[PDB]
Structure formats: structure tokens, C-alpha cells
Amino acid sequence: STSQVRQNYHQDSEAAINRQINLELYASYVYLSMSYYFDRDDVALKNFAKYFLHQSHEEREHAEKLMKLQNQRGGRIFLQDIQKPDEDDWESGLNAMEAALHLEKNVNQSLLELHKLAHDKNDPHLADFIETHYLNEQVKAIKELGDHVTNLRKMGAPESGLAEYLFDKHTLGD
């Protein structure tokens, strides 16, 4: 059945949107995992925990806004299993920041391919949606993650436990 609102909305776009939803939920789950790793009594970096929890909720928001878009265009949401993150133990603050950087670039890659698909399907509403709500947000996230990684390395992480403690206090704790 075709939705009464659907217009210029290609089935491949609809499917790409469903895959992006699962990917955002996945990213949120990875960040949830990292957050409570820093909450462990044998890690105990509360500002790393808080930073990654904040990222988790932002990713959930990303997924919900894609779900809204799907219904706005008259597509149909099909949710899939949310796979568990690849690690249970994230080793260190630097390691988590590096894993997060890798994650955000993979999510960025998927958004860029979604945008190319919108361009190729002459769907300028979908292209502007990705441009407006996702692309610069990804670029900021990756730059910020790059910055943190750089500082942690220069301070002597992951070896120096002083480095991660001070970075938690002075960069991530306001």
C-alpha cells in the first residue's frame, strides 16, 4: 500500500534510512558500554563515564529523528536486532577515545553514502535533511575525538595513569 503522504521517496532511500536507524542505535549501545566501563571501581574515571553517557543519549536522539523522518516521508520503520558492542572491556581512556573516533568515521561513511543515494535519487529533501542534521555534527564529533586522542597521547597515555586522571579532570570535567 502506498502512503497518502509519500512523494519522491525511493524504496532504496527508505531501506537506507532503516539501516541508518539501526546503526545509530548501535552507536548509542557502544557508548553506553564505554560509559559504564569507566564507572567500574577499577577504572573510576567519572568524567570519561559522563562524556560517553552523553554521547549515548545523543545517538539515541539521532536514531529517533531518523524514525520521524521515515514516517514524515511515508516510509515504514523496520527495526532489527541491536548487536552488542565488539568489546566488554575498553582498556583505557585513550583506547575508548580511539574506538569512538573509528566508530564516528564509520557512521560518517554511512551518512555520506546515504547522502549520495539521495542525490542519485533526486531527493533534495532527504539530502538537505542529512546535510542539515547529520553531516556537520559528524565532522564536529570526529574533530573533537581527534583533539582528545591527540591530547591523551601527548600527556603520556595510556601508560601514564596520571595523564588519564588529569585529562578526566581538566578536559572532560568542564
Ligand X SMILES: O=C(NO)c1cccc(C(=O)NO)c1
Please indicate if the annotation marks 57 as binding a ligand. Answer: no
Mention every residue, 6+ apart, whose C-beta is less than 8 A from residue 73. Answer: 5, 6, 9, 13, 14, 125, 126
Please indicate if the annotation marks 59 as binding a ligand. Answer: yes
Q: Does 54 bind ligand X (CB under 6 A)?
A: no
Site for Zn ion in 42-61 (CB under 5 A): 59
Site for a copy of itself in 51-90 (CB under 8 A): 60, 64, 67-68, 70-74, 76-85, 88
Binding partner of 76, given Zn ion, ligand X, a copy of itself, none, CB within 5-8 angstroms per partner class: a copy of itself
If binding means CB under 8 A, how many residues of this protein chain bind a copy of itself?
85
Please indicate if the annotation marks 104 as binding a ligand. Answer: yes
Selection from 105, 109, 106, 120 nearest residue 13 by Cα:
120
Selection from 110, 105, 157 nearest residue 130 by Cα:
110
Residue window 29-58: x/- pattern of binding to a copy of itself, with contact defined by CB under 8 A: x--xx--xx-xxxxxxxx------------
Residue window 82-121: x/- pattern of binding to ligand X, with contact defined by CB under 6 A: -------------------------------------xx-
Task: Count CA within 13 A, CB hemisphere, residue 43.
Answer: 22
Which grid coordinates are listed for 32?
A: 553506553
Query: At what angle are helices 93-120 and 136-155 packed, to 10 degrees?
Result: 160
Q: Does 24 bind Zn ion (CB under 5 A)?
A: yes
Mention every residue, 6+ apart, whose C-beta is less than 8 A from residue 83. Answer: 26, 29
Q: Position 29: which residue type?
A: Y
- Cα 53 from chain centroid (whole Å): 12
Please indicate if the annotation marks 138 as binding a ligand. Answer: yes
Residues flagged as binding site for Fe cation: 24, 59, 62, 104, 138
Interface with ligand X by CB under 6 A: which residues?
119-120, 122
